[PDB]
Structure formats: C-alpha cells, structure tokens
Amino acid sequence: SKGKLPPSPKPRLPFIGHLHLLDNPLLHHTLIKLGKRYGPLYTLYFGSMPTVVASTPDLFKLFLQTHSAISRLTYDNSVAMVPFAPYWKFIRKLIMNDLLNATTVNKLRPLRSREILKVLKVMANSAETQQPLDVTEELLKWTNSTISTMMLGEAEEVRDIARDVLKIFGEYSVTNFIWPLNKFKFGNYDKRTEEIFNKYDPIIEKVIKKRQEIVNKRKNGEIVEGEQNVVFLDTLLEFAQDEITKEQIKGLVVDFFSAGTDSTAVSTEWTLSELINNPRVLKKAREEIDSVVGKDRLVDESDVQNLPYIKAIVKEAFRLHPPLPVVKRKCTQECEIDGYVVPEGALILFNVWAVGRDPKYWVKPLEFRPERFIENDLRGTLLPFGSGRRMCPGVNLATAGMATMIASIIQCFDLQVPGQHGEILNGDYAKVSMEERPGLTVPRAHNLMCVPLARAGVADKLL
Ligand code: HEM
C-alpha cells in the first residue's frame, strides 16, 4: 500500500493534464512508448480525469476482481446494458428459467448459413467478371444483415431496417474522431439525414407487430405458413406477457443493434488480410479444410470445432489486430492495484494491443504464426461467467460465425490483389497494406479490394 497513484509522466498541465502528450491518433502506439518508461501501470490525466493504463494480463485480472467489482464496462456500446439496464432483468429471468439458452442461438444457424452463402455468391460473380470486389463493404453488409435477420427475420421490412441501421451507423461513424461521439455537435443535420432517422421507429414498430401476430398464432395453436424460421425476437415476445412493455422491447432491439457488430467485420478483414500476406498459413488452412470438410460440400458452422488451425488463425489475428486495441473500463470505487491507489471514477485503459505484441508473452510476436496456439471463445472476455455470452447471437457471429465465413471464403476462392496499373499483383507483390485507421474500433486504413478466383472444382461442386 503505497498510498499513491501509479506513476505519471511530466509535465501535468492545469486544465488539459497530459492530453498534450497524446500526439498520435493511434493512441495505443503512444501508450506503448509511455509504458516503456513508466512501466506496466501508469497514470495519465485526461483533462482533470485520472486515467490508469495497464499493459499486462495480470493487471487486467486485478481490475476484474471483487471488492462489487472495482471496475465496470463503459457505455461506449450497449453491452453495459446487460448488468445495468433494468429492463434487461427480463432477459435474465428467461435465462435462469431455461427459456433462453444456447439452443436458441444454435437454431438460428440456417439463417446464418444463408447470409454466408449470399457473400460467396457475390464473390462468385466477381470471379466471373474478374472485377475487383470491395470486401470491406461486403463484410459490413454481411454482419449488419446477419444481425438483423437473426433478430427480426427474412421479411422485406427487415431488409429495409437493415439498410436504415447501416445508414445510421454511417452517421455515427462520421461523428468519430478517435473515439465515437467526440466531435459531435448539436446541429440540424439535413433532409437527407433526417429521413434516415425518421424511418427507424415506424419500421421497427411494424416488424414487432408482424412478429407478435406470428407468436400469437403459434401460441393459440393456429397453423402458420410462409416463413417457418423462428427469429430471436419471437422468443422475447412469447414470454413478454406471461402471468415488459412495447417500449422496453424496442429498447432491447436498440441494444441488440449497437453492441459492436462492426467488430466482427473488422476482425474478419484483418484475418483475411493476414492470410493474403502469409501464403504459408493460407496453404495450410486450405489443406485442413480439404482434409476435414472436403471439396464436395461447403464448410458448415458445425465443422469449426474440427478445424483447429482455422480457429488458431482467428486467435492469431485477434492477438495482432484486436478490433479494440485499447479496452476502456471505469473504476467503481477506490481500490488498490499492485500497491497503487486507483481513484473512484478513474478511466481504466487496457492496452490489449500492446500485450498482443509483447515478446514477454509471445515468441517472435510480429510473426503471424497460428502454430503458437497449437504447438503448446475461439478468439483467445472480461464479463463474468453467467453474463449471457452463450445466449447471444452476436457473440456467436463474432466467433463461430466469423470462423465459418473465413473458412468458406478460402475453401472456394483464391484472393487476388489488384494493382495500380492494369495488373494483378503476384506473388511477392501480392500483399495488402496493414496500416491502421484511428478509431475506438481500429480497422485497416485501406479497404480490402480483391479479385476472387474460383478454385478448381468449386463452381460446379459448391456454388
Ligand atoms: C438478440 C440479439 C442480440 C444481438 C444482435 C447481440 C449483439 C451483440 C454483439 C454484436 C456483441 C459484440 C460481440 C463481440 O464482438 O465481442 C454482443 C456482446 C454481448 N452480448 Fe449480445 N446480442 C444479442 C442478444 C444478447 C442477449 C439476449 C444476451 C443475454 C445476456 C447477450 C449478452 C451479451 C454479452 C454478455 C456480450 C459481451 C460478450 C463479451 O464481451 O465477451 N446478448 N452482443
């Protein structure tokens, strides 16, 4: 018990604290340089707010222990609603009563498979035209559609809400500087953005109405025909009035759309980019798929458990390119971490990007070497056991779902990299830039452009 904060740099300035030292939009690079001098736990003042920066796994675990836990999720996204929002108590009761469980997420697999197939068919078309495909854009549409279809169904009104949610996400990303809602200003927008906002509430109200009558017709024993797929919202509506309000249902839907869907699109692109840049690993990945699954049917989500190298590839891309390089938490009460005092209300920053590249934990950390997870949650979480990860379609998409998409892509296609003067790069130049774009979520700065090439025995046997 040293009775003092973790060490801090100099100088601390009256109003801005240490903010003048943050001279890099990619904050995690600056936090590493500071960590080299001041150690694995140090204090920065974001204005008047003390902010403690940790960069070891042991420090992360200390911040997750109970005193009430000394740190909590922030409201940067809707995941914080799970422990804190009162209307999420309804979800917790469904879980404890075995009415919402892992089987609920497993039964959505056919919906997830059809969304995967849609992407493969887009790539197949680009293979036939031999035209560059914006894989970044396709992965954003894939994750956005899969979330909305799992939640609400295949109706055309859900296609409309998916396009609207993606547009809202677009307006949410332009208010971002480094972290979201930092350059936001109270303004008037325009008629274009106004129509985007006003479209959401009437569309979701109609979708809930159309799903409520399906639930009622199933409850009263009446037969239903047309769309036999059961959506996640149907499970919520089926027990909403047992013996939760419409507004609170709409609030759950808002939370379901804003928990970080884009993280899966970002991590999928980082993984594909590492595979393109590491032909040895990509060849070995296709050999596993050809051996475990074969060339006669598409990879299925049930195969992922039998694809250890594919799972190691996802872990290895997560180690090098965590979607959130800096994870934020808030101190809930005065506590002591490794002898230092952490004050109530302090912002806590986990530099997970630094840990992923630290030679103290990883042999040759700059190498994309999935074997490190073999020769010795397929991403390799901070929420306690029993928080509901097993019942969440978003966690499924971020793990088994992304692994299935990546395996399906490389099973069917070679990814050619187009060049800047009428040529396809290959093979020493067949690489993509790994430069980062600043953000809370940090994607590749350059969109992933690829010219798919159908592998031999794929068009007729698979697509
Ligand atoms: C119904 C549709 C739902 C959607 C579309 C959705 C969406 C998401 C997404 C996109 C994430 C981010 C996962 C990641 O990238 O790491 C997430 C996280 C999470 N969700 Fe959901 N969710 C849904 C329902 C639920 C439910 C019912 C629960 C019940 C407790 C739940 C609990 C969680 C938890 C605990 C996390 C955090 C997991 C972690 O950080 O490791 N979700 N959700």
PDB file of N, CA, C and O in Angstrom, residues 156-195:
ATOM      1  N   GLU A 156     -39.125  -8.508 -45.885  1.00  0.00           N
ATOM      2  CA  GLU A 156     -38.573  -7.372 -46.616  1.00  0.00           C
ATOM      3  C   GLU A 156     -38.539  -6.118 -45.754  1.00  0.00           C
ATOM      4  O   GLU A 156     -37.692  -5.244 -45.968  1.00  0.00           O
ATOM      5  N   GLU A 157     -39.443  -6.015 -44.777  1.00  0.00           N
ATOM      6  CA  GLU A 157     -39.393  -4.905 -43.833  1.00  0.00           C
ATOM      7  C   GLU A 157     -38.125  -4.947 -42.990  1.00  0.00           C
ATOM      8  O   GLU A 157     -37.655  -3.904 -42.520  1.00  0.00           O
ATOM      9  N   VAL A 158     -37.557  -6.137 -42.790  1.00  0.00           N
ATOM     10  CA  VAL A 158     -36.291  -6.248 -42.074  1.00  0.00           C
ATOM     11  C   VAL A 158     -35.127  -5.860 -42.980  1.00  0.00           C
ATOM     12  O   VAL A 158     -34.143  -5.266 -42.525  1.00  0.00           O
ATOM     13  N   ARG A 159     -35.219  -6.191 -44.271  1.00  0.00           N
ATOM     14  CA  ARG A 159     -34.247  -5.682 -45.233  1.00  0.00           C
ATOM     15  C   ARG A 159     -34.221  -4.159 -45.226  1.00  0.00           C
ATOM     16  O   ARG A 159     -33.151  -3.548 -45.336  1.00  0.00           O
ATOM     17  N   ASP A 160     -35.391  -3.529 -45.082  1.00  0.00           N
ATOM     18  CA  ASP A 160     -35.451  -2.071 -45.026  1.00  0.00           C
ATOM     19  C   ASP A 160     -34.825  -1.532 -43.746  1.00  0.00           C
ATOM     20  O   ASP A 160     -34.121  -0.516 -43.775  1.00  0.00           O
ATOM     21  N   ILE A 161     -35.073  -2.190 -42.610  1.00  0.00           N
ATOM     22  CA  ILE A 161     -34.494  -1.697 -41.365  1.00  0.00           C
ATOM     23  C   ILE A 161     -32.990  -1.931 -41.346  1.00  0.00           C
ATOM     24  O   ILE A 161     -32.242  -1.150 -40.747  1.00  0.00           O
ATOM     25  N   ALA A 162     -32.516  -2.984 -42.019  1.00  0.00           N
ATOM     26  CA  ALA A 162     -31.081  -3.238 -42.076  1.00  0.00           C
ATOM     27  C   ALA A 162     -30.365  -2.149 -42.860  1.00  0.00           C
ATOM     28  O   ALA A 162     -29.294  -1.685 -42.451  1.00  0.00           O
ATOM     29  N   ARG A 163     -30.944  -1.723 -43.986  1.00  0.00           N
ATOM     30  CA  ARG A 163     -30.350  -0.635 -44.754  1.00  0.00           C
ATOM     31  C   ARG A 163     -30.386   0.673 -43.975  1.00  0.00           C
ATOM     32  O   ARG A 163     -29.459   1.487 -44.074  1.00  0.00           O
ATOM     33  N   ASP A 164     -31.445   0.895 -43.192  1.00  0.00           N
ATOM     34  CA  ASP A 164     -31.534   2.112 -42.391  1.00  0.00           C
ATOM     35  C   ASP A 164     -30.534   2.092 -41.240  1.00  0.00           C
ATOM     36  O   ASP A 164     -29.873   3.102 -40.969  1.00  0.00           O
ATOM     37  N   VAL A 165     -30.409   0.954 -40.553  1.00  0.00           N
ATOM     38  CA  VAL A 165     -29.451   0.840 -39.454  1.00  0.00           C
ATOM     39  C   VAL A 165     -28.030   1.063 -39.957  1.00  0.00           C
ATOM     40  O   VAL A 165     -27.212   1.713 -39.291  1.00  0.00           O
ATOM     41  N   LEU A 166     -27.713   0.536 -41.142  1.00  0.00           N
ATOM     42  CA  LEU A 166     -26.382   0.742 -41.701  1.00  0.00           C
ATOM     43  C   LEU A 166     -26.137   2.215 -42.010  1.00  0.00           C
ATOM     44  O   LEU A 166     -25.021   2.716 -41.834  1.00  0.00           O
ATOM     45  N   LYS A 167     -27.174   2.925 -42.467  1.00  0.00           N
ATOM     46  CA  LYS A 167     -27.042   4.359 -42.704  1.00  0.00           C
ATOM     47  C   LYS A 167     -26.870   5.124 -41.396  1.00  0.00           C
ATOM     48  O   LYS A 167     -26.076   6.068 -41.326  1.00  0.00           O
ATOM     49  N   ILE A 168     -27.612   4.740 -40.355  1.00  0.00           N
ATOM     50  CA  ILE A 168     -27.421   5.354 -39.043  1.00  0.00           C
ATOM     51  C   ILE A 168     -26.004   5.101 -38.544  1.00  0.00           C
ATOM     52  O   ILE A 168     -25.340   6.008 -38.026  1.00  0.00           O
ATOM     53  N   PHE A 169     -25.515   3.867 -38.701  1.00  0.00           N
ATOM     54  CA  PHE A 169     -24.133   3.560 -38.343  1.00  0.00           C
ATOM     55  C   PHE A 169     -23.156   4.438 -39.115  1.00  0.00           C
ATOM     56  O   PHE A 169     -22.119   4.845 -38.578  1.00  0.00           O
ATOM     57  N   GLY A 170     -23.471   4.742 -40.376  1.00  0.00           N
ATOM     58  CA  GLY A 170     -22.624   5.638 -41.144  1.00  0.00           C
ATOM     59  C   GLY A 170     -22.557   7.034 -40.552  1.00  0.00           C
ATOM     60  O   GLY A 170     -21.483   7.636 -40.477  1.00  0.00           O
ATOM     61  N   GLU A 171     -23.705   7.565 -40.119  1.00  0.00           N
ATOM     62  CA  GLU A 171     -23.720   8.874 -39.474  1.00  0.00           C
ATOM     63  C   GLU A 171     -23.089   8.823 -38.090  1.00  0.00           C
ATOM     64  O   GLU A 171     -22.587   9.839 -37.598  1.00  0.00           O
ATOM     65  N   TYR A 172     -23.112   7.654 -37.446  1.00  0.00           N
ATOM     66  CA  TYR A 172     -22.479   7.501 -36.142  1.00  0.00           C
ATOM     67  C   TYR A 172     -20.961   7.464 -36.259  1.00  0.00           C
ATOM     68  O   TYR A 172     -20.258   7.864 -35.324  1.00  0.00           O
ATOM     69  N   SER A 173     -20.441   6.998 -37.396  1.00  0.00           N
ATOM     70  CA  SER A 173     -19.001   6.891 -37.584  1.00  0.00           C
ATOM     71  C   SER A 173     -18.360   8.198 -38.033  1.00  0.00           C
ATOM     72  O   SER A 173     -17.151   8.371 -37.849  1.00  0.00           O
ATOM     73  N   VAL A 174     -19.132   9.120 -38.615  1.00  0.00           N
ATOM     74  CA  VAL A 174     -18.562  10.399 -39.028  1.00  0.00           C
ATOM     75  C   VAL A 174     -18.428  11.369 -37.862  1.00  0.00           C
ATOM     76  O   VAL A 174     -17.591  12.279 -37.917  1.00  0.00           O
ATOM     77  N   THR A 175     -19.226  11.202 -36.802  1.00  0.00           N
ATOM     78  CA  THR A 175     -19.025  11.966 -35.577  1.00  0.00           C
ATOM     79  C   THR A 175     -17.815  11.492 -34.787  1.00  0.00           C
ATOM     80  O   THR A 175     -17.479  12.103 -33.766  1.00  0.00           O
ATOM     81  N   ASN A 176     -17.163  10.422 -35.234  1.00  0.00           N
ATOM     82  CA  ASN A 176     -15.989   9.891 -34.560  1.00  0.00           C
ATOM     83  C   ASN A 176     -14.745  10.664 -34.978  1.00  0.00           C
ATOM     84  O   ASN A 176     -14.563  10.993 -36.153  1.00  0.00           O
ATOM     85  N   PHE A 177     -13.895  10.966 -34.000  1.00  0.00           N
ATOM     86  CA  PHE A 177     -12.569  11.480 -34.279  1.00  0.00           C
ATOM     87  C   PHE A 177     -11.558  10.374 -34.073  1.00  0.00           C
ATOM     88  O   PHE A 177     -11.044   9.794 -35.036  1.00  0.00           O
ATOM     89  N   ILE A 178     -11.272  10.075 -32.811  1.00  0.00           N
ATOM     90  CA  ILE A 178     -10.639   8.826 -32.414  1.00  0.00           C
ATOM     91  C   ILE A 178     -11.634   7.915 -31.709  1.00  0.00           C
ATOM     92  O   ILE A 178     -11.771   6.744 -32.053  1.00  0.00           O
ATOM     93  N   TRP A 179     -12.346   8.441 -30.737  1.00  0.00           N
ATOM     94  CA  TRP A 179     -13.394   7.658 -30.117  1.00  0.00           C
ATOM     95  C   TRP A 179     -14.759   8.204 -30.524  1.00  0.00           C
ATOM     96  O   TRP A 179     -14.893   9.402 -30.798  1.00  0.00           O
ATOM     97  N   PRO A 180     -15.786   7.357 -30.592  1.00  0.00           N
ATOM     98  CA  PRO A 180     -17.076   7.814 -31.119  1.00  0.00           C
ATOM     99  C   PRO A 180     -17.709   8.871 -30.230  1.00  0.00           C
ATOM    100  O   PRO A 180     -17.505   8.904 -29.014  1.00  0.00           O
ATOM    101  N   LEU A 181     -18.484   9.747 -30.866  1.00  0.00           N
ATOM    102  CA  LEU A 181     -19.166  10.846 -30.191  1.00  0.00           C
ATOM    103  C   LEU A 181     -18.167  11.692 -29.403  1.00  0.00           C
ATOM    104  O   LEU A 181     -18.276  11.876 -28.189  1.00  0.00           O
ATOM    105  N   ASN A 182     -17.158  12.179 -30.121  1.00  0.00           N
ATOM    106  CA  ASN A 182     -16.186  13.123 -29.586  1.00  0.00           C
ATOM    107  C   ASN A 182     -16.169  14.448 -30.328  1.00  0.00           C
ATOM    108  O   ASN A 182     -15.941  15.486 -29.703  1.00  0.00           O
ATOM    109  N   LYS A 183     -16.402  14.440 -31.640  1.00  0.00           N
ATOM    110  CA  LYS A 183     -16.575  15.656 -32.420  1.00  0.00           C
ATOM    111  C   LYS A 183     -18.046  15.977 -32.660  1.00  0.00           C
ATOM    112  O   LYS A 183     -18.363  16.793 -33.532  1.00  0.00           O
ATOM    113  N   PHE A 184     -18.945  15.348 -31.907  1.00  0.00           N
ATOM    114  CA  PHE A 184     -20.371  15.576 -32.088  1.00  0.00           C
ATOM    115  C   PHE A 184     -20.739  17.009 -31.726  1.00  0.00           C
ATOM    116  O   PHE A 184     -20.258  17.561 -30.733  1.00  0.00           O
ATOM    117  N   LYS A 185     -21.592  17.602 -32.539  1.00  0.00           N
ATOM    118  CA  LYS A 185     -22.094  18.941 -32.275  1.00  0.00           C
ATOM    119  C   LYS A 185     -23.599  18.982 -32.414  1.00  0.00           C
ATOM    120  O   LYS A 185     -24.170  18.336 -33.292  1.00  0.00           O
ATOM    121  N   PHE A 186     -24.237  19.742 -31.528  1.00  0.00           N
ATOM    122  CA  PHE A 186     -25.687  19.881 -31.559  1.00  0.00           C
ATOM    123  C   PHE A 186     -26.110  20.706 -32.770  1.00  0.00           C
ATOM    124  O   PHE A 186     -26.136  21.939 -32.711  1.00  0.00           O
ATOM    125  N   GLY A 187     -26.434  20.033 -33.873  1.00  0.00           N
ATOM    126  CA  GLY A 187     -26.768  20.714 -35.109  1.00  0.00           C
ATOM    127  C   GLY A 187     -28.127  20.348 -35.668  1.00  0.00           C
ATOM    128  O   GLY A 187     -28.952  19.754 -34.969  1.00  0.00           O
ATOM    129  N   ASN A 188     -28.370  20.692 -36.931  1.00  0.00           N
ATOM    130  CA  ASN A 188     -29.670  20.479 -37.534  1.00  0.00           C
ATOM    131  C   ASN A 188     -29.709  19.397 -38.594  1.00  0.00           C
ATOM    132  O   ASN A 188     -30.786  19.053 -39.090  1.00  0.00           O
ATOM    133  N   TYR A 189     -28.546  18.861 -38.948  1.00  0.00           N
ATOM    134  CA  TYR A 189     -28.412  17.788 -39.952  1.00  0.00           C
ATOM    135  C   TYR A 189     -28.976  18.320 -41.275  1.00  0.00           C
ATOM    136  O   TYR A 189     -28.782  19.502 -41.597  1.00  0.00           O
ATOM    137  N   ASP A 190     -29.663  17.490 -42.056  1.00  0.00           N
ATOM    138  CA  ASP A 190     -30.290  17.925 -43.296  1.00  0.00           C
ATOM    139  C   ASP A 190     -31.461  16.996 -43.595  1.00  0.00           C
ATOM    140  O   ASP A 190     -31.714  16.032 -42.869  1.00  0.00           O
ATOM    141  N   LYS A 191     -32.177  17.294 -44.683  1.00  0.00           N
ATOM    142  CA  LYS A 191     -33.325  16.475 -45.058  1.00  0.00           C
ATOM    143  C   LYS A 191     -32.912  15.053 -45.408  1.00  0.00           C
ATOM    144  O   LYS A 191     -33.707  14.119 -45.247  1.00  0.00           O
ATOM    145  N   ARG A 192     -31.681  14.865 -45.886  1.00  0.00           N
ATOM    146  CA  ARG A 192     -31.214  13.519 -46.180  1.00  0.00           C
ATOM    147  C   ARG A 192     -31.014  12.693 -44.924  1.00  0.00           C
ATOM    148  O   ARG A 192     -31.499  11.561 -44.827  1.00  0.00           O
ATOM    149  N   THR A 193     -30.303  13.250 -43.941  1.00  0.00           N
ATOM    150  CA  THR A 193     -30.076  12.530 -42.693  1.00  0.00           C
ATOM    151  C   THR A 193     -31.341  12.468 -41.845  1.00  0.00           C
ATOM    152  O   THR A 193     -31.531  11.510 -41.086  1.00  0.00           O
ATOM    153  N   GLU A 194     -32.212  13.472 -41.963  1.00  0.00           N
ATOM    154  CA  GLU A 194     -33.463  13.461 -41.211  1.00  0.00           C
ATOM    155  C   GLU A 194     -34.323  12.263 -41.594  1.00  0.00           C
ATOM    156  O   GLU A 194     -34.870  11.578 -40.721  1.00  0.00           O
ATOM    157  N   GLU A 195     -34.449  11.991 -42.896  1.00  0.00           N
ATOM    158  CA  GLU A 195     -35.258  10.862 -43.344  1.00  0.00           C
ATOM    159  C   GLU A 195     -34.675   9.534 -42.877  1.00  0.00           C
ATOM    160  O   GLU A 195     -35.426   8.588 -42.612  1.00  0.00           O
TER     161      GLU A 195
END
